[PDB]
Amino acid sequence: MSWNGKDERKLSVQERGFSLEVDGRTVPGVYWSPAEGSSDRLVLLGHEYIEQVAKLLVGRGISAMAIDGPGTDVVGLDAFPRMWHEGGGTAAVIADWAAALDFIEAEEGPRPTGWWGLSMGTMMGLPVTASDKRIKVALLGLMGVEGVNGEDLVRLAPQVTCPVRYLLQWDDELVSLQSGLELFGKLGTKQKTLHVNPGKHSAVPTWEMFAGTVDYLDQRLK
Amino acid sequence: MSWNGKDERKLSVQERGFSLEVDGRTVPGVYWSPAEGSSDRLVLLGHEYIEQVAKLLVGRGISAMAIDGPGTDVVGLDAFPRMWHEGGGTAAVIADWAAALDFIEAEEGPRPTGWWGLSMGTMMGLPVTASDKRIKVALLGLMGVEGVNGEDLVRLAPQVTCPVRYLLQWDDELVSLQSGLELFGKLGTKQKTLHVNPGKHSAVPTWEMFAGTVDYLDQRLK
């Protein structure tokens, strides 16, 4: 529950590191914001592309924050299931992000807040959005019910009640299309839309990952 | 191959009727255009919502044209399969739209041309786009492989090579989601994106049907 981290300043984006102590764990984080003056909305980024998204969001006057989770793509590694549980799994993720958002709200003031995160970002983001009603819109994707925390995802999906845009890749070698569909179907909200594009897990079209998601959060996050 | 039809003028949109004689058939049509001066792009509209889309397109400086095909939604009617075949089926649709586009091109000058059409509009549009390479982008949807011309759709889908946005409704009572997915998967183009929203066949969200499709064609039709 304190800055540093250690902080820099790249162009018109101010980046500040922070660190949290949560239920016995050390939680490293980063906060991106306009270098002057203020910023009226916030997005939590779950995970290079994260830094890219953060820059674009700041460009729309939207601050961004990320912490590390219990984690080509890490979810495809044989060692990944062990890493996830050793890191406290879904319950730890929920508490860590709740503590991180508490911190930012006290330091920067509470603002309309969204979630952006694909793959492990959805393993984290779907539970967080279900659990923390401060999340007013979520961009999720590249994850299904056969994920490492699939049980939790299926259980918590009906409790996602905010608007969602969900991305899947048709030829995703890590997440079958059917598994991704099953999870999308379980989301509680009626204000959900699924975009599916051709290609492998890492091949979300850039206009979908960048312009598309940033426009979606910019429009829907109020 | 002549105007009338019989024509009116509503606001800044000029509407002109036309009529064609094609391989023994009488083909009724409508042409929407800016009332002054010109318009550099055209969209063929396959089918109230058609008139709505046409108005929005004209607003972006995009003219629109529609002819009647061999046809709540007509595709759900027990009499519909008979009507489709009695109307010459897919081969008749292809020739009729080819003749209609020939007519407009001679009268108004050839322009970058797109396709918009859902349900019966895709029963017609997918074959037309496959057959007529003047179609440079297509908005398709609400149709699958279990459609009345499903065989033709499956056969011709690999020959759709232009960009496509495809819409499906999760709870579509007329077109199963799986049938819609199967057809989307068969489209030849790599520049295709599927948007799926919750609800029944008639419940495409208005922001998806209007703003979304018009923005898509406006951006992609060049």
Query: Which residue in this structure is represented by tokens 């029944």?
Result: B200
Cross-strand bridge partners of residue A164: A138, A192
**B154 part of contact set with chain A, CB < 8 Å:** no
Mutate to test the interface with A, among B189, B196, B215, B220 (most CBs of A within 10 A): B196
**CA distance to partner chain B, nearest, from residue A150 (Å):** 22
Q: How many other C-beta atoms can be found within 10 angstroms of the C-beta atom of residue A3?
A: 14
Going by C-alpha positions, the residue among B150, B46, B153, B140 that lies closest to residue B101 is B46
CB of A153 closer than 8 Å to CB of A124: no
Q: Which pairs count as long-range contacts for B12-16, CB under 8 Å and 24+ apart, including other chains?
A: B12/B58, B13/B54, B13/B55, B13/B58
Rounded Cα–Cα distance for residues B117 and B20 (Å) = 21
Q: What are phi and psi of A207, to 5 degrees?
A: -65, -25
Q: What angle do CA A39, A51, A98 make, to 5 degrees?
A: 65
**A196 part of contact set with chain B, CB < 8 Å:** yes
B25's tokens: 């058939």
Going by C-alpha positions, the residue among A74, A53, A59, A67 that lies closest to residue A104 is A67
**B195 part of contact set with chain A, CB < 8 Å:** yes
Closest B-chain CA to A216: B212
Task: List chain B residues with CB under 8 Å of A205.
Answer: 193
**A186 part of contact set with chain B, CB < 8 Å:** no
Rounded Cα–Cα distance for residues B69 and B47 (Å) = 8
User: Do the chains contact at A196 and B196, CB–CB below 8 Å?
Assistant: yes
Q: What residues contact B148, with CB distance under 8 A and at least 6 apart?
A: B75, B80, B81, B84, B123
DSSP-assigned states of every residue in A207-221: HIIIIIHHHHHHHH-
**B198 part of contact set with chain A, CB < 8 Å:** yes
Q: Which pairs count as long-range contacts for B81-88, CB under 8 Å and 24+ apart, including other chains?
A: B81/B148, B84/B123, B84/B148, B84/B149, B88/B23, B88/B25
β pairing state of A25-34 and A13-22: antiparallel
Whole-angstrom CA distances from B210 to A61, B54, B90, B139 are: 28, 10, 27, 11
Task: List chain A residues with CB under 8 Å of B190.
Answer: 198-199
β pairing state of A192-197 and A164-169: parallel
Whole-angstrom CA distances from A65 to A28, A51, A54, A135, A222 are: 11, 10, 8, 13, 17
Q: What is the dihedral of CA A79, A82, A87, A93, to 10 degrees?
A: 90
Rounded Cα–Cα distance for residues B59 and B215 (Å) = 11
Which burial class, exposed, middle or buried, applies to B5 when counting CB atoms under 10 A from its CB (0-12, 13-18, 19+)? middle
Longest dimension (CA), chain A: 46
This structure's resolution (Å) is 1.6
Task: List chain B residues with CB under 8 Å of A169.
Answer: none
Q: What is the dihedral of CA A147, A149, A155, A157, to 10 degrees?
A: -60
Whole-angstrom CA distances from A19 to A29, A52, A68, A92, B36 are: 6, 22, 10, 15, 63
CATH code of the domain covering residue A133 = 3.40.50.1820
Which burial class, exposed, middle or buried, applies to A2 when counting CB atoms under 10 A from its CB (0-12, 13-18, 19+)? exposed
Domain count for chain B? 1
Q: What are phi and psi of B192, to 5 degrees?
A: -125, 145
Closest B-chain CA to A170: B185
Breaks (C-N over 2.5 A) in chain A follow: 47, 71
Closest B-chain CA to A197: B193
Helices (H), B109-205: 120-131, 150-156, 177-186
**B192 part of contact set with chain A, CB < 8 Å:** yes
Q: How many other C-beta atoms can be found within 10 angstroms of the C-beta atom of residue A4?
A: 9
DSSP-assigned states of every residue in A91-157: HHHHHHHHHHHHHHHHHH----EEEEE-THHHHHHHHHHHH-TTEEEEEEES--TTSTTHHHHHHHG
Which 3 state secondary structure label does DSSP give B7? coil
Q: Which domain holds residue B91?
A: 1-222
Q: Specify the experimental method.
A: X-ray
β pairing state of B2-3 and B135-141: unpaired
DSSP-assigned states of every residue in A56-110: HHHHTTEEEEEE------GGGSTTHHHHHHHTTHHHHHHHHHHHHHHHHHHHH--
Sign of the dihedral defined by the CA atoms of residues B94, B95, B96, B98, in that order: positive
CB of A139 closer than 8 Å to CB of A216: yes
Whole-angstrom CA distances from B90 to A212, B99, B160 are: 36, 14, 15
Breaks (C-N over 2.5 A) in chain B follow: 47, 71
Helices (H), chain B: 49-59, 80-86, 89-108, 120-131, 150-156, 177-186, 206-207, 213-220
Task: List chain A residues with CB under 8 Å of B204.
Answer: none
Rounded Cα–Cα distance for residues A68 and A44 (Å) = 11
